[PDB]
Design a protein around this nucleic acid. Structure first.
Ligand SMILES: [Ca+2]
Ligand SMILES: [Ca+2]
Ligand SMILES: [Ca+2]
Ligand SMILES: [Ca+2]
Lengths: 445, 440, 440, 445
DNA sequence: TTAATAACCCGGTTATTTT
DNA sequence: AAAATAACCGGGTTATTAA
DNA sequence: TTAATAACCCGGTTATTTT
DNA sequence: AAAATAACCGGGTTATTAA
């Protein structure tokens, strides 16, 4: 059967939380204290080597008050029919079942009065609902819960694994083999994985993802990850560890966006920001996964032009039409753009750059809910609104009259030329500019 | 209310022991392993910090089998009707006490299936007798035995103390202060003391003593002690020698150290008395169970107001340890001659005749553990090694040079003795006390 | 002033090595013993906290014999006349400096008589050449080598850092943050870095490279590196495969992992390029000393201004790596017909007709480390496993269905393939590039 | 060879000490800190495993100031002729031996600059006198001092032992066997023994004794101990660890003083007081060993009477001539004491107590000269001035008219009747009384 | 009846006869 | 010269005689 | 001389003919 | 219906032609 819920009330970080669970569920976050204490919350209920020591003074919320620790595990237990897992758990709970028709089962922990005798006194109780919970009979040192479940903890009989930080003293090619053996191998059914490395998250299927937030209220969001899956997961494996992911389309934009972010603050990686190269203008294949994850996508797009196939003389918009499909709206009409054949070269592109503003001026109301949503659109490319902000400083580097002419020929080659000569006082006006609000929305400040 | 018996059946040394206890138990012996495992048996019965870990494979007897560990305590409450502990312990049992007419109570430990799941498991059972033992109810991690008793273990509610080796890093005046503090204050009511030092047993009264043995069968003797600084070192020895003089111990230390220097670790001890009295020592040592060996010398005494009328002191002094009637007085007329030398020499020839026609009285003396000479110890030493006395004294009579000043010329012997010399002291039947101390 | 050589003679892995060094130098390899013992060989020469303990039995080579341990550091100070560190070195050498025309300096360690007194003993010795080596004067516990240098060892005056494994308990952004700081700051002038992570080698300039081998003779190559995210993972391998496609790496991650999953620990690596350019990679890896293997495919391009005039780009991209002269253009006339499929099918026969009578050019291509196919990789994949493509695709022509979706139908072959299938791929001459990844 | 003297200047407790030390040194005292620092001073001079770590900040005088730690050892080298250790030390110091005529040799230590480089820098120097000290040549890690001396430290070539606390985890007969292995066995020549137990001092000959005082200035008393020896050392083995020793004569006088001393304070066992019972009126055999030790003797005696063996009618004083023999003075003349023959029993003793009081009246200058020295004399018997200050409370427990007559018949048997029941208010008036001034002179408070 | 020395045992001394 | 012999001291134990 | 697309290579999408 | 075919986007490399 599957896990359903856990209700950890008065443990050392939690107040009243209901984390939804599943088999094969993976824990990540920015804090290590909450990811350690969520595994010790499972060790205090299902493992006797932690349950035999009792509760100390430290694991009562902060250190005291509201002295009733409850950990309640939910495991449903109404699959019946085929599997031997449900039979091997229903054959031992026969004094604590209300009927053979209930659909939720309860494994409840209780602990009271740490102020007297300096002991936690864990009482375990079985039942089918929160009314009429009946305590677990056990003769000596061993409960009737401990005969059934088995807990194996890893840090460098129903079996539940608990793995904390396995990539420390592990090779980076071995983590992909461990990512195969955790998920597509049928040996492991019930684990609770805590990790920090993206190579353990390459091959995932039927997996609930618990993200632990960096704030002190330690609230968790549980999302199922259901699904070329491998290239969709390998590029997004470093973006699963970030709440705020900027989606840029090319490698030369990341060269400027690394330096502009590193000249302002080193702590954008510490806050949870990430730069993701899409490699093209295909943004819909990532946000269908990030809608299910709930990761806040930030999208920067540039609009372009295209002649129609069977129609000559009218042009079909590319960037506004591909921004239309991310919201699922009705596509706009085609705009007749005329180019005379006697003028070619740069001046056809120079007239089409002014046509890119002339298709932007009367479609500003379309951008009025685009930029109100999480998609941002430029006017020609990134190389022109780079020139509209710091273009008085680009002339001394290139030693040329028109730096846009020098940059559109070799695109990625001359973005290296902007790296080796910049100042810390330079390029702060492009940081606070309104045309680069995606990098404001990444850092959250 | 006070403890009566323990029944530790299948523990890691014990096989079937019924060890009688009381309050203020004191454990000594030549093995530290059996005393540590006795205190571990009390920790697996009454302490939750050792009960929460369970039994290992090594906690059973040998490496495997005889897999039913019983540690059963006997409390013997009866009805004392004024003490607060008995009313409290009959208040917390409630349903597991069968009647108010019963007097003996049981706390029973069980352990089964060590070969399955690699766990010993401890099951605790209350009851008024060995039949109809009922399980102790407990809700979570806490038994109802844990709400009654408290165990404090010392190694450098109802309170039980367990003290193992407190004289390591402790001054001896602090050992005497701990000795009066253990048996004077009312806070130390229940303990199980394990020690090696004689200074912790100076003040001692109303004390059960457990002497564990050096053998592997780990059987022990329990003796109640109810009522001198050198007698406290004799409590650590099963077999002691009762001698009269400080000059005798100088010879019996040199003769024992030239052959067998490890007689002290086997369990032997030499106890100086300082006189010919032995009835004050064996009346204590019979209650201890300590096997006494007595070497004494017979003497004679004249009467009062009579000349030539004598009685015997040393034969009647051995007779007073039995309870038999005294001997008749022996009359002898002594010649005048040399008073300093030959008047003693007539009495030494008379005392050999007195020992000759009272040999059948000595036949039940030396058959039991009291041994007796015929003149003194010095002529019996002169009959053994008198061919070696004249080569180091340069005198015609070495008994004459040594009877006047005894201790000052006894160190003239022991500074020059070879390792080959005095092998005949062990092989004499006259000096069988020094072989009876060894036990061969 | 910057280092040029070391001579670690009889240390516990080394027999006779003369390892060239420079500043900011980086050690990597497949053994951690051979990278720990290099930093301990520097700590035994230049750090007093390891030199004060002496040599043990295990610090010599093998368990015993070859009993003269020499660690010799070569400075090559020359005459720089402006820097602070050369004058700070030469002001305190004093009497051991021979003349001002000398350019080579020595620090010679010695060790003798390990079998006597259970002590290794370390004797330090300055000098300008290997003849006339004079001892370092030191009055008490402190040498005159200790007044010049300083060693700080990192494990989670003239200052030498020694860093061993810093990415253990370090975040992946912090490795790229540490990667610039070793090579732009003036504080880290002299270090010896040991690592396993590719993120610490992103920013890298003016760096001697020490690669230790997996063999037991622990010989190493000293290569200067002077001047990309996937290329930093290719620095930790000797045999790398240079492929064009991301869909092609999906094809070689099934064939390798169904037979030999331990190819990554042996020292193999798959490097995507993203295009048919290879001259930007092997011009870098010639200075790296990394043995490249290149798999490429030949193509043809019509020339501008003419109809039916073609030239061969795929042979010229193999010609430019060796520096030979280009080939001449060919003429072929192709009819109209079906332009999507049947126009390509005549070009495949013309490409095979080109590949038939240019085989003597390919005879030195495949004799070098560049490998060429016949039309494309998906069509001599059809020569290997084309009898098994019709089970999964259920199509008449599987390469008609595969060329229109190069990546979209490759996961159908990856997701449905047995372990017995694609085992004959390794013994083709067409797919013989993947055997030199393993090295068999 | 023969050690002479050490000179430890600026080490952890010492300021300027010249502690005379021969072969077979035995160290006792009330502090373990100064004995451990004396053995670590010998380890910082002659052991390379302590010299390779150097001096810290903590092993200067307080923690700083007087920045020259100097340990100078004298061995004096001038036995010549026969022994091979003298030939070994004159064969290894072939350079720094100035002549073969001077009879003093030095092994020095120097260290400076604790505040610079945080390192002690021990420099060792050989010399024949304090002028012209010469550095020891050593090639690498090993000095030329380390080839000669060998140091073995025990805590549970010239071979020098250092033993600290060996009686922990040993039997008492093993301590007697270890004393026989140390002193009368010729395996150990040079040692520095530190101990707390009396059983390691039973067999003892040719031994320099260092007593370390309990005060902070750590001054040491250096006395050579030369000598029935075995029972004298068994009597004095618990008295060598005490600086104030009371010399009493009986066990009844011991158990009188034991309850009275324990009801005031338990501090006197911690301070260093000890009651040594003799077993008779022989005191000259104890003070001849305490004069060589320097232990101050406190002596309680009682004066008696004896008839002369050759003259009838004149009595010879025993207790006054016994006190005269301890000072070596001229013995006083005999006093004619008349006893009629018809008066027998205890009626003779009642006049004999008055005749002893009449002897004590006219020889008051002699008892004043005795009590001006370290010997104390009673009026007649301890029981009479027991009765003179307690004996109004001795009639309520004996239920007798005369408690002196009730106690002189059973001297020990009725002495334990005072032990089991006395209040703590009792025997405070006699504790500052002048007749029991030895009991106040034991503790010195 | 009830204490007070003759005698004995484990040790120590000190000045007076004694051959 | 040097080797006893009484008379005490620090502890116990009878037992006859004085009281 | 000197840039500007015609072709080629490693990936992706979306409307328009086409049989 | 479903199978190509242009025309762009994110990167590189020649090479003939307009300029
Ligand atoms: Ca763009
Ligand atoms: Ca005798
Ligand atoms: Ca290809
Ligand atoms: Ca007296």
């Amino acid at each position: 059967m599957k896990f359903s819920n856990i209700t950890i009330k008065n443990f050392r970080n939690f107040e009243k939380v209901n984390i939804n669970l599943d088999n094969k569920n993976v824990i990540f976050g920015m804090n290590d204290i909450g990811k350690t204490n969520f595994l010790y919350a499972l060790r205090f209920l299902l493992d006797k080597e932690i349950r035999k020591f009792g509760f100390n003074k430290s694991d009562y919320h902060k250190h005291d008050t509201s002295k009733k620790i409850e950990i309640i595990l939910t495991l449903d237990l109404s699959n019946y029919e085929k599997d031997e897992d449900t039979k091997k758990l229903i054959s031992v709970v026969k004094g604590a079942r209300t009927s053979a028709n209930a659909d939720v089962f309860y494994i409840a922990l209780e602990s009271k009065y740490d102020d007297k005798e300096l002991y936690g006194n864990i009482i375990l109780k079985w039942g089918s609902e929160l009314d009429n919970l009946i305590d677990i009979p056990g003769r000596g040192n061993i409960n009737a819960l401990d005969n059934v479940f088995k807990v194996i903890y890893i840090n460098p009989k129903i079996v539940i694994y608990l793995i904390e930080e396995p990539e420390i003293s592990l090779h980076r090619s071995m983590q992909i083999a461990l990512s195969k053996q955790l998920f597509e191998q049928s040996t492991y059914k019930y684990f609770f994985l805590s990790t920090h490395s993206p190579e353990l998250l390459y091959e995932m299927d039927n997996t609930r993802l618990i993200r632990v937030h960096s704030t002190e209220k330690v609230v968790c969001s549980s999302h199922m990850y259901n699904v070329v899956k491998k290239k969709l997961n390998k590029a997004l494996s470093s973006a699963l560890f970030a709440e705020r992911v900027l989606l840029i389309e090319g490698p030369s934009e990341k060269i400027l966006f690394e330096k502009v972010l590193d000249e302002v603050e080193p702590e954008y990686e510490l806050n949870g920001g990430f730069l993701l190269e899409v490699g093209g203008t295909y943004f819909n294949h990532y946000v269908c996964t990030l809608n299910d994850l709930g990761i806040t996508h930030i999208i920067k797009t540039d609009n372009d032009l295209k002649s129609k196939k069977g129609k000559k003389g009218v042009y079909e918009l590319l960037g506004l039409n591909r921004c239309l499909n991310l919201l699922g709206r009705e596509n706009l009409d085609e705009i007749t753009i005329d180019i005379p054949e006697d003028i070619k070269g740069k001046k056809k592109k120079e007239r089409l750059n002014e046509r890119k503003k002339e298709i932007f001026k009367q479609y500003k109301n379309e951008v009025g809910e685009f930029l109100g949503e999480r998609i941002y659109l430029s006017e020609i490319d990134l190389e022109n609104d780079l020139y509209s902000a710091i273009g008085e400083s680009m002339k001394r580097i290139f030693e040329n009259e028109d730096p846009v002419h020098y940059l559109q020929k070799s695109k990625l080659f001359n973005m290296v030329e902007l790296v080796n000569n910049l100042s810390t006082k330079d390029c702060f006006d492009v940081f606070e500019h309104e045309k680069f609000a995606c990098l404001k929305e990444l850092v959250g400040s």
